[PDB]
Amino acid sequence: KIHYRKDYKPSGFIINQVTLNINIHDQETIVRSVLDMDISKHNVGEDLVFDGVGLKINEISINNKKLVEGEEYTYDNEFLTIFSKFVPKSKFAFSSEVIIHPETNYALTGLYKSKNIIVSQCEATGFRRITFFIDRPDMMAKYDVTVTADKEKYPVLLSNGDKVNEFEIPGGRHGARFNDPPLKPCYLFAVVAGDLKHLSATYITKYTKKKVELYVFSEEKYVSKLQWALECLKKSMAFDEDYFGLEYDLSRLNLVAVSDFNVGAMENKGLNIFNANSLLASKKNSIDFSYARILTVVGHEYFHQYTGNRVTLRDWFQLTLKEGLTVHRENLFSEEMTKTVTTRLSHVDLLRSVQFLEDSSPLSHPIRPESYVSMENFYTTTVYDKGSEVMRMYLTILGEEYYKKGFDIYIKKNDGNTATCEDFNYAMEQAYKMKKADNSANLNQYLLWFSQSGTPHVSFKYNYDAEKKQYSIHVNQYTKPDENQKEKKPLFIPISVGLINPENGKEMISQTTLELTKESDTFVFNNIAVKPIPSLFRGFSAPVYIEDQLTDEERILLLKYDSDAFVRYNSCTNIYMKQILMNYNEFLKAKNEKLESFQLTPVNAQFIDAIKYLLEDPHADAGFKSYIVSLPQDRYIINFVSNLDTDVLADTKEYIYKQIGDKLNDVYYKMFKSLEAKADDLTYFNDESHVDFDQMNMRTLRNTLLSLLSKAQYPNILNEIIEHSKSPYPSNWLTSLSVSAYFDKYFELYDKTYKLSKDDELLLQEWLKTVSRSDRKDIYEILKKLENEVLKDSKNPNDIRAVYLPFTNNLRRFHDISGKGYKLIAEVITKTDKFNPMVATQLCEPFKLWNKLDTKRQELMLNEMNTMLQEPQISNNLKEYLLRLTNK
Ligand SMILES: O=C(CNc1ccccc1)N[C@@H](C(=O)NO)c1ccc(Br)cc1
Numbered sequence: 001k002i003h004y005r006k007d008y009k010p011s012g013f014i015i016n017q018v019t020l021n022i023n024i025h026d027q028e029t030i031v032r033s034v035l036d037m038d039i040s041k042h043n044v045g046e047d048l049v050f051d052g053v054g055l056k057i058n059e060i061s062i063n064n065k066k067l068v069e070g071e072e073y074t075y076d077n078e079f080l081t082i083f084s085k086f087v088p089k090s091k092f093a094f095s096s097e098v099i100i101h102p103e104t105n106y107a108l109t110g111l112y113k114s115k116n117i118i119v120s121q122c123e124a125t126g127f128r129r130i131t132f133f134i135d136r137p138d139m140m141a142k143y144d145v146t147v148t149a150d151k152e153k154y155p156v157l158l159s160n161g162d163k164v165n166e167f168e169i170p171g172g173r174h175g176a177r178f179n180d181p182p183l184k185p186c187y188l189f190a191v192v193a194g195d196l197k198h199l200s201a202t203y204i205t206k207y208t209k210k211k212v213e214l215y216v217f218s219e220e221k222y223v224s225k226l227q228w229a230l231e232c233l234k235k236s237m238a239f240d241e242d243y244f245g246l247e248y249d250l251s252r253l254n255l256v257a258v259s260d261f262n263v264g265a266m267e268n269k270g271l272n273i274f275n276a277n278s279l280l281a282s283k284k285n286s287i288d289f290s291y292a293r294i295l296t297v298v299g300h301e302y303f304h305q306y307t308g309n310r311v312t313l314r315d316w317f318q319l320t321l322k323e324g325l326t327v328h329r330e331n332l333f334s335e336e337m338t339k340t341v342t343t344r345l346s347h348v349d350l351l352r353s354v355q356f357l358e359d360s361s362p363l364s365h366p367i368r369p370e371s372y373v374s375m376e377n378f379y380t381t382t383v384y385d386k387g388s389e390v391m392r393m394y395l396t397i398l399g400e401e402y403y404k405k406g407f408d409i410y411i412k413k414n415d416g417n418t419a420t421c422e423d424f425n426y427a428m429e430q431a432y433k434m435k436k437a438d439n440s441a442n443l444n445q446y447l448l449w450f451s452q453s454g455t456p457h458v459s460f461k462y463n464y465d466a467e468k469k470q471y472s473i474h475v476n477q478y479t480k481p482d483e484n485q486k487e488k489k490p491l492f493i494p495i496s497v498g499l500i501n502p503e504n505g506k507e508m509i510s511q512t513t514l515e516l517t518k519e520s521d522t523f524v525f526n527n528i529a530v531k532p533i534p535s536l537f538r539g540f541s542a543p544v545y546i547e548d549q550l551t552d553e554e555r556i557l558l559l560k561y562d563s564d565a566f567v568r569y570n571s572c573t574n575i576y577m578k579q580i581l582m583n584y585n586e587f588l589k590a591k592n593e594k595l596e597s598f599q600l601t602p603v604n605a606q607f608i609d610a611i612k613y614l615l616e617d618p619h620a621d622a623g624f625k626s627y628i629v630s631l632p633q634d635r636y637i638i639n640f641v642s643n644l645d646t647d648v649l650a651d652t653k654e655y656i657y658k659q660i661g662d663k664l665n666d667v668y669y670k671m672f673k674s675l676e677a678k679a680d681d682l683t684y685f686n687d688e689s690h691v692d693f694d695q696m697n698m699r700t701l702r703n704t705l706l707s708l709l710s711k712a713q714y715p716n717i718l719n720e721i722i723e724h725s726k727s728p729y730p731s732n733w734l735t736s737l738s739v740s741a742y743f744d745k746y747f748e749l750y751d752k753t754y755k756l757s758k759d760d761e762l763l764l765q766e767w768l769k770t771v772s773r774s775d776r777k778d779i780y781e782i783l784k785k786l787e788n789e790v791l792k793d794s795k796n797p798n799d800i801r802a803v804y805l806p807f808t809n810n811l812r813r814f815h816d817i818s819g820k821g822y823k824l825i826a827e828v829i830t831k832t833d834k835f836n837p838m839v840a841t842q843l844c845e846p847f848k849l850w851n852k853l854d855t856k857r858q859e860l861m862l863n864e865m866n867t868m869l870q871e872p873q874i875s876n877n878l879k880e881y882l883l884r885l886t887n888k
């Protein structure tokens with residue numbers, strides 16, 4: 001079945017109360033469920049159909065009358081059908097007893113066992129794998145849940161709500177009962193059982209002065225890695241209080257880390273469950289990246305408590321209303337807490353690489369799709385990250401004060417209810433009306449951000465009249481037709497702009513957000529004393545392709561002197577892109593024409609001079625510096641080249657990196673040495689509450705320079721590499737492994753770092769990733785060694801994703817013209833699809849650009865997707881993904 005957004009219809013049934021008994025045994029888990037139900041005003045006498053996947057039925061009843069299979073109900077392992085003739089006309093009880101098997105549930109959806117912890121994952125459609133339900137988010141009910149288990153193996157028992165009873169059971173078993181009176185959808189139900197250890201704190205809310213208990217749990221081995229998460233939770237609570245004025249409403253919040261998890265974390269009410277790699281860190285055993293990941297993922301699930309949990313989705317097509325909005329709240333949080341410009345830059349760099357690729361691929365979809373078949377395939381960077389950019393533009397358009405007023409309208413009008421994207425637009429419209437002093441002004445055009453797929457292109461032309469002191473910015477917007485809209489309409493595009501005086505680098509006009517609402521417009525500015533350089537889309541103010549039509553000399557001057565971090569970064573990006581496209585076509589012609597000699601256009605010398613200038617600026621940001629020395633991401637570049645030949649791109653990037661290194665390697669080396677003291681400062685190495693994002697950026701800059709100097713084979717850099725391997729920080733010593741790929745000591749540092757990584761589950765996975773991404777000529781043999789010596793038959797999604805996905809970014813080797821790379825990942829996708837369809841679909845990520853490559857590689861990748869499509873046991877998830885991806 002394909003579900004279409006236009007076909008939403010309230011249920012003809014009501015579920016008022018869920019009473020659950022989940023009894024965990026060694027070989028099986030027994031779920032007894034009583035559903036206090038009713039007939040709704042939309043009933044039309046239909047069969048009572050519950051969702052129920054993979055359940056072994058012991059018995060069902062209606063009003064303590066056991067139902068007979070065949071004459072009274074059919075169950076096909078997916079839908080339980082009780083025919084209307086046996087369905088009461090008033091308040092009735094439906095009860096069932098089913099058997100499920102968490103120990104062998106390797107799809108990690110529903111109830112499953114992660115190492116020695118039983119844990120649930122119910123969003124989107126996992127609750128029906130636990131018991132029968134009308135498994136859809138508008139079906140709101142009260143929950144009363146008892147869990148029993150062997151007490152020695154499972155001493156800690158958690159579910160939603162208040163623990164109201166704890167009782168011993170003969171046979172060394174024990175039980176706990178949890179009552180959660182407030183209504184919730186079933187995807188927010190959770191249960192956890194295990195030998196869990198914890199850190200805890202008490203938070204007192206800002207206004208009600210309520211005492212909230214905060215618990216963070218892990219397995220005993222890793223309980224020393226919980227401190228940052230707890231700190232991040234407190235920060236998230238303060239931020240929503242400080243920025244949005246929202247307080248936590250429950251008496252307890254639990255965070256739980258498990259080793260086996262399909263995604264990052266899950267916002268189950270009062271019982272947030274996390275991938276261990278997004279909750280656990282320690283400075284001895286984690287790379288720097290973990291600290292920003294934990295901060296964002298803890299924040300993200302907390303912010304869901306309002307945007308997702310208190311204000312609910314009517315239906316799954318509204319997904320971006322909770323995910324896009326929560327990512328937006330997440331990003332505002334991280335920007336505030338890290339206080340570095342590279343936080344925002346990192347979100348743009350993700351959007352413009354990953355999400356732009358998806359939105360020009362055959363998978364392109366608006367942030368509110370009109371249909372789906374696999375609800376799990378709905379969870380995408382379009383829905384999340386373009387969703388967040390659409391959510392963020394409300395704030396750009398409105399400003400902080402009226403944005404907060406509109407957000408408050410939304411929460412006040414809809415708290416405790418279901419909502420839709422239109423509800424949010426309406427709340428923002430009310431704030432737009434107050435801001436414009438015009439109650440006729442509206443945001444109806446803005447709704448197209450939700451329904452229109454594809455990335456708008458925004459282009460510029462300029463005019464300066466020197467005698468008139470008059471400056472004109474002519475703007476054009478354009479979206480390519482795709483499979484979702486033949487004719488694209490103009491969106492409401494807010495363009496944050498400044499005007500830079502090229503003589504002194506000063507701002508020429510006040511804060512200004514151009515509201516482009518037509519396919520084209522001309523914005524004129526008077527009293528402009530000299531010809532300015534425009535600073536366009538400051539902060540990346542709309543999710544668009546920016547065609548700035550500036551000269552490289554103009555872009556260099558913005559890069560040196562503009563006030564906005566993103567426009568500086570983007571101006572640099574654009575200079576690189578111009579060079580990349582030029583040298584690419586030059587390498588491509590020489591290859592196509594079989595030239596025996598040929599020329600390459602060198603990198604702009606004034607550009608290199610500007611990079612040196614900024615690198616030598618003591619007062620500049622170390623994180624920003626590391627962005628300017630890095631060419632754009634390969635998946636950003638691919639949006640600008642038809643039939644991209646990856647070897648020619650590899651040769652292009654190589655030439656450009658070499659050109660710049662040939663001028664700046666001595667600068668790179670000087671800085672790498674002068675940065676050591678502050679970057680590797682150990683003063684707070686044993687304080688897990690002390691987290692310094694500037695210092696971590698300094699290490700990123702050192703590790704970026706080290707990589708450049710190593711690839712360049714800078715004299716005696718191997719000494720620096722070996723000394724780096726001795727650093728206490730894993731970002732440093734795992735960096736020493738990857739950059740030693742260019743040297744004969746690689747396999748000596750392979751063994752050294754493995755021995756340092758093998759005793760921590762998460763640190764080993766980072767090691768796997770480092771090996772996987774190593775720029776090695778023998779990388780295929782090294783992956784085979786990982787498979788045989790380390791990965792083996794692990795079904796842990798973290799292990800599989802660590803071995804294979806970084807490798808897929810290896811431009812020369814993953815795209816080896818034999819197809820051996822496409823064949824290797826295809827085999828892994830098909831093998832993984834037999835037990836975890838969602839992760840199988842994640843492993844298809846490299847294929848998303850398949851139709852953007854040279855015709856030979858297009859054919860290689862298509863052949864492999866057609867082979868996976870032909871596997872007789874293919875999951876629905878994977879089949880539907882690959883059918884869409886290949887346009888079938
Ligand atoms: O962990 C992440 C990371 N983001 C993400 C992951 C996959 C696809 C798109 C984005 N997302 C979780 C979230 O949003 N928690 O609040 C989540 C929860 C359930 C389901 Br089904 C899917 C994702």
Ligand SMILES: [Zn+2]
Binds near residue numbers: 300304322323326
């Ligand atoms: Zn989320």
